């Protein structure tokens, strides 16, 4: 995968507290969309102005990989998120750059096609009684073709509490019971376990068919989750707040999961994820990367997800409404997310495929940085 | 060391682009002061009141290591530098307040007294020649009495290439026949080599009598920085840009390094710094924080260094001039760091003993969080 020198001349950020786009602009005037992380976004795109744009800027990408090892490197006092939820804009970017002047979407020029993309609904709440999560669940089951559910155990980071007593003991038995035989059934507890519990937590899963046990202890402790892989059958997953590379070797060296889930976002872009999934190839391991809303970082991972050799069963697909992302409203054109027998979509439109809001952009806070 | 109950009522931040101040109010009308991370610390204000002042404001910090704790657990999609460097404002203030309303340093707080602390005279330049290094030492030396004292090897993370061919193996022989043989020589290659590179340099080092390696390889790679380590006699030190307290178990389990070197600012203040001294203590390493600049970084590691029993041999103490650090000019009423015979002195005045500059805080942008 190569591909001709381009300079960027200007880096801009559209952007409020919780989405930021970024629109790159090389020499010869092509130009190309992407977004940093949402969450803080304004604050990300700061970052994007202060620390990532001045070592990109009139810099050759054409080793994009290089470049930002750089920036990393200029960096280095500033290990940790905000750098790479800056860095993933400017890559992004620059993927639909590259699209759009091949005329190839983004999963073709990582040597895929477009295509679909099987879509597992993914519940975000804890504060939803077990019974209405199933209930909700079985109705986009109807709706939307959908044959795989993720639901949420124990309290967020809860030092080994549950939301409340016996939440989780319910809610397992009850989807297995109200989905059916045939369902495919994952669970994500959220850093909340000691090894003992996940693993008492692991078995119940297992004696009602879970395939998928997301981040049962303290996702910065791997020795936790390596123990907790190794007692148990049903598949320990994790990586989704993982932003260093050295730690992905770690872990991916160590095989403290049985399946990674890289945030493209969090990661710093499509190059860095590109990295971890090929990490995760030569060690057999599958990549269902964490997408956690509806803006682009779904779409980035629907065409990541048509590329890669080792990916994973499914795209994660946050099924909350509006009430719980008022923000996700009206940020494309044309919606990207519609899904058929539970299924999302990959056009053959050139890049991303996707084009933001002129109206969103309209009421956006805007930055630019020069060459 | 128990604590009075406490309710932070209002965080308020005093910041430019280079360093920014943090003024706490407990609900018994108490104020205390501290400093954010410089650099970049108008980005690191936003964070604080973003991030930090929401989960700390209203709350009893009484035990604030648990409180800090909650921060980083309620922030956990945000690991690294920006959310500790934020946090250590906070964290800095509720010293210099605990310290007013005891009356006392909070050296003495901290378990130790006023008095003196052994200085080195950091350089942090790699531009200058070696033979004008030398020069500007012996300067310092007859001016201030240092005894110790600290250059640079290698490119910063300069990739195993030095700064220009042959700069450091001119430097290492010139500042031991410079300086002559009692004074304590220190070098920092700031993540620049390989272990064999590094080894290789290590021993010309001690052939020198040099006494203090620091971060010879690039500091992310652990297993790199042990092997060095284990290969040399002369002590091996690093630290500086750890901020997370799960690397800094894993790197003292390990004994990667002999002189652990915790920036008070970086890793999130002094209770976290604490932590971080006693894991060391367990371990029998000592203690030599880094301290770059003379804003409070510098002061905060000199009420440290009189208390931990674990200290390490000497303060760093930059001697770069005004060329250098414009911004740090006129940020306090009183002078802390004169230095004689090659000390610095930590007096009894109560808190950390130091008050911003009025006419600095009048130019300075203002942002205030409240219960
Ligand atoms: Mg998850
Ligand atoms: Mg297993
Ligand atoms: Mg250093
Ligand atoms: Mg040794």
Same mark, same amino acid.
């Given at each position: 995968l190569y591909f001709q020198s381009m300079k960027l001349t200007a880096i801009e950020t559209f952007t409020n507290e919780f989405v930021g786009f970024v629109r790159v602009t090389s020499?010869?005037?092509?130009?190309?969309?992407?977004?940093?992380?949402?969450?803080?976004?304004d604050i990300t795109c700061?970052?994007?102005?202060?620390?990532?744009?001045?070592?990109?800027l009139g810099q050759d990408c054409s080793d994009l990989d290089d470049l930002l090892d750089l920036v990393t490197e200029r960096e280095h006092k500033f290990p940790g998120s905000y750098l790479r939820r800056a860095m993933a804009g400017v890559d992004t970017a620059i993927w639909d750059l590259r699209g759009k002047q091949?005329?190839?979407p983004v999963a073709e020029l990582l040597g895929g096609s477009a295509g679909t993309i099987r879509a597992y609904a993914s519940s975000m709440k @804890?504060?939803?009684?077990?019974?209405?999560? +199933? =209930?909700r669940m079985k109705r986009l089951?109807?709706? /939307?073709?959908?044959?795989?559910?993720?639901?949420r155990a124990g309290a967020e980071v809860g030092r080994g509490r549950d939301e409340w007593p016996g939440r989780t003991e319910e809610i397992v038995p009850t989807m297995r019971r109200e989905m059916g035989d045939?369902?495919?059934?994952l669970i994500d507890a959220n850093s909340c376990y000691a090894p003992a519990q996940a693993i008492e937590l692991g078995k119940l899963l297992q004696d009602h068919g879970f395939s998928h046990f997301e981040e049962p202890c303290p996702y910065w402790e791997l020795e936790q989750t390596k123990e907790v892989s190794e007692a148990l059958d049903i598949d320990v997953t994790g990586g989704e707040q993982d932003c260093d590379l050295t730690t992905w070797r770690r872990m991916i060296d160590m095989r403290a999961v049985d399946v990674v889930q890289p945030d493209?976002?969090?990661?710093?872009?499509?190059? @860095?994820?590109?990295?971890?999934?090929?990490? +995760? =190839?030569?060690?057999?391991?599958?990549?269902?990367? /964490?997408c956690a809303n509806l803006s682009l970082v779904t779409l980035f991972t629907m065409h990541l997800?048509?590329?890669?050799?080792?990916?994973?069963?499914?795209?994660?697909?946050?099924?909350?409404?509006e009430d719980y992302y008022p923000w996700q409203d009206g940020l494309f054109v044309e919606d990207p997310y519609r899904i058929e027998d539970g299924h999302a979509r990959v056009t053959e439109a050139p890049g991303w495929g996707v084009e933001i809001c002129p109206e969103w952009l309209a009421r956006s806070a805007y930055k630019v940085s020069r060459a």
């Open positions: 020499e010869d005037g092509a130009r190309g969309w992407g977004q940093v992380s949402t969450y803080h976004s700061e970052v994007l102005h202060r620390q990532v744009a001045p070592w990109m091949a005329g190839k @804890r504060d939803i009684t077990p019974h209405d999560e +199933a =209930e089951r109807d709706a /939307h073709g959908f044959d795989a559910f993720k639901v045939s369902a495919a059934l493209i976002l969090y990661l710093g872009g499509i190059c @860095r994820t590109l990295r971890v999934a090929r990490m +995760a =190839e030569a060690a057999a391991l599958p990549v269902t990367p /964490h997800l048509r590329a890669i050799p080792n990916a994973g069963k499914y795209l994660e697909f946050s099924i909350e409404g």
